[PDB]
Design a protein around this ligand. Sequence first.
Ligand SMILES: [Mg+2]
Ligand SMILES: [Mg+2]
Ligand SMILES: [Mg+2]
Lengths: 344, 341, 342
Amino acid sequence: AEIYNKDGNKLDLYGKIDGLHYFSDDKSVDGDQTYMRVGVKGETQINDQLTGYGQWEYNVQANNTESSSDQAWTRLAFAGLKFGDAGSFDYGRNYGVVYDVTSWTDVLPEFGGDTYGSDNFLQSRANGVATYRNSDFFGLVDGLNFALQYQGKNGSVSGEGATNNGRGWSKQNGDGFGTSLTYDIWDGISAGFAYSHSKRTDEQNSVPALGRGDNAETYTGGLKYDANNIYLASRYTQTYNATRAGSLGFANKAQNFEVVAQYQFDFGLRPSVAYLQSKGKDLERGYGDQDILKYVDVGATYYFNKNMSTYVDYKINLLDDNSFTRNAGISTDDVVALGLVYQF
Amino acid sequence: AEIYNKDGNKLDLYGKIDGLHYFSDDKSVDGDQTYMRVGVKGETQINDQLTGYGQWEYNVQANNTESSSDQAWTRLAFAGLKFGDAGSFDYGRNYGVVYDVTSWTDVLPEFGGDTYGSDNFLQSRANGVATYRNSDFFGLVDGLNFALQYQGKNGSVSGEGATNNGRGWSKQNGDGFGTSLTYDGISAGFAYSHSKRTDEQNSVPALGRGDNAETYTGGLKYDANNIYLASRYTQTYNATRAGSLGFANKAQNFEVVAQYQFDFGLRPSVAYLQSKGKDLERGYGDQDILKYVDVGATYYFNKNMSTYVDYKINLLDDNSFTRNAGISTDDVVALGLVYQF
Amino acid sequence: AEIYNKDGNKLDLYGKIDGLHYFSDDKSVDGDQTYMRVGVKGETQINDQLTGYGQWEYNVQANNTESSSDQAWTRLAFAGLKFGDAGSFDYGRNYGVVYDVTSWTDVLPEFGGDTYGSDNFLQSRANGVATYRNSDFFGLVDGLNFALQYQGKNGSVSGEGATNNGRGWSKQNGDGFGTSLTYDIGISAGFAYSHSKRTDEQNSVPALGRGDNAETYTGGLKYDANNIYLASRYTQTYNATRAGSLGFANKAQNFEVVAQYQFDFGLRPSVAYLQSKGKDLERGYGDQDILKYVDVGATYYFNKNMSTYVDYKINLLDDNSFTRNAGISTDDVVALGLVYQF
Ligand SMILES: [Mg+2]
Ligand SMILES: [Mg+2]
Ligand SMILES: [Mg+2]
């Protein structure tokens, strides 16, 4: 909600409160999943060719007790400058540019968006990203959106590989960069490409048993159709030393594919059907080729209005239980989600 | 404070900042107790019959350092729909319906509200509650309200009894149900709850054994002519904590409070509270779990600022039960200055 | 931002989002340092001579992951009354009155303000402070301000020295009090004093620092006019200045000086020198430098809501047994920040 707009400065206090329950035979996901999000988004006019901005987004779990630990975290926190019509720069915790394309399939009622994770190189939300964007390809092509992003090393907790803000191997990165390019081809049809290259860290190449290599790389292509009450999107990503092999490390190579179809009825119901897979290749310890993710998703959202909705989502999990999924901690069970959400 | 009201949607950013200090011989409660609360309450008009709403309430302690852990937590987080005469429905972290009645005695300047706890079946705030409420009995009887409530299992951290949101035995529950009924300046109230207990509750702590946690509550309130009087009695089975040692197989909990509101802003308060545990294992037998007289006063400067003193006159004796279970037997004085928004 | 003002009550929701990176050979400070702050400040008119107020300020780190621990904390939380000319009183988590004067040199683009820390007696933000303030000496002497402050013990986690809100020896305190006095002659002078009981764990746990009381004495001078900022202050402490992780300095001498200029087009360069000199340290340490650097940097103000900055800590400490064992950083640091304020 816009709660301040005065003398060239604007502030939005926004969020949602999501009354959410999961039903699954997997006891690590079954049960109450209630949470909320709260954030601020602000803008300050500097001059005719310059606007300042900042955004913070917080996640607050509400499915555990008042004595539980580690229930809140920051999703986004960045500050930036917009340079007229010709671009922007921001720095902080923000989305990696790969998500410029992979966001197109991250539209399921509840599930989806899970062939990658957060703090996973530049695939999703990430610490310390400096992001340059231009929406007219340097004045040459209207509608052609370019991004270039740099990320500094976020290393180990201690020792030779450390930085101030250290973390475990699954969420480490070396210095890296990303780029994306997206374009509306026809009315309502868009195409996009993204690439990332990051140095890996010494702990990534020594602590977990899976995944070895100097660099983490991703290649993504996507398509979207959004018109006439119909939403279709597909994307394909090939990764190298970048996709998590559950708790066991990284996949030397992975091939990640998502497709989604939705329809918006004018009375407020939006059914959704999707297919997702992540195919790991050349895994160590005799694993070879393994499925990391494989499910059909069917669900629907009912929008009461712009501030209130309810939804059901059903993850039909096609993974077989085997020594890889067991050892890596990957859920092979179906899940049903039921939600009622207030947004502000 | 209402900070947004536009095109059918309203948002309140509300809270308080409570500069609070306790004086006690009990070193685990003595000292600075400053904290604040902040929350949002939102409502959206969907159509003539239907409004959607959400509420989040956060508690933020401010009595420890900037390197201290576990200083903030969510009290409430729920989303709901209100229908008209048909009632309301909400889901999330919210009050158990037993508090619809026991709240009538939870009005002391600082203390009170402590014969039960949070995440304690449906006695107070709870995870994963679905709550239906009906006002005026479908519009047929003015002042008659009722509620129906369901809670899904919140299990252990790992193993066979787990759920995603696992916790220790003290705050676990199986599937449960609660109901309340209140009727009106004089009011009477009843509440009942029934929850399945978990395998950890029946094996980890030494105290309390049974398949089910049950509560029965009756209460009365007089609120008129600047006088507030309230009393309630609750009988529980396998549901009242015996401090850190488990649950009381049975307990009998009683509270009574009297207050007067002077025009100039002073509100003195006198109360008596007790919790009596029966049939405790390990030789404990019958034990007092809580017993005190409370005297205090709140001074309201206005609707946004108050100050208060409260004096817990603790009538428990020190014994091996109070020591082992971590129950305070010392007197406490609280002094507070509070800003509300 | 003031987001509510109605029927005698007002509320400000304020903060900043600071996109911040450090470059250093010290791996414990090097890298992303992005964070934000958010708070509320409210006031309510009670009557002609009485206003109530409250403030909360929260710090939220954003430089680590979504599964990281302990990433947020309360800086300030207090409630108070202002009685016109008779003064104000507030209680909660608030600044110690020593900061009334030492804040004069806490103006660097990024660094500075580090000859003391938080929860460090009455040197900075502190739990359980009751603070009386009087502005312009009961309305009788423009520019003459004073404060009186009391702080109850904040003790150990358990045992005989416990309080409900226990913490480690570095952040403990006994009962104490403090006072400040400032006088505006754009030119000001200031004095502050504090005296606290030390706690048993401050004497029994760490290697360094022994004594029943912690005391500080501060004097400051400030020139702030004609686009020029010049400030200096000197503090002598007893059993009160941390000697890194090793304990406290039996005596310390802390000195800071800063000069800045505000150009009309927005740039504010800054040059400063800071040192903390510890004396009579145990275990053979004797006299040791606790802090010693020159700071050079600049802030560019786009407007009142947006700025960018660079800061360069030129660290004059050396690797020796003291800095090494105390965990005191000896390396240079460059900070680069972009900050949105609301
Ligand atoms: Mg490889
Ligand atoms: Mg029993
Ligand atoms: Mg000494």
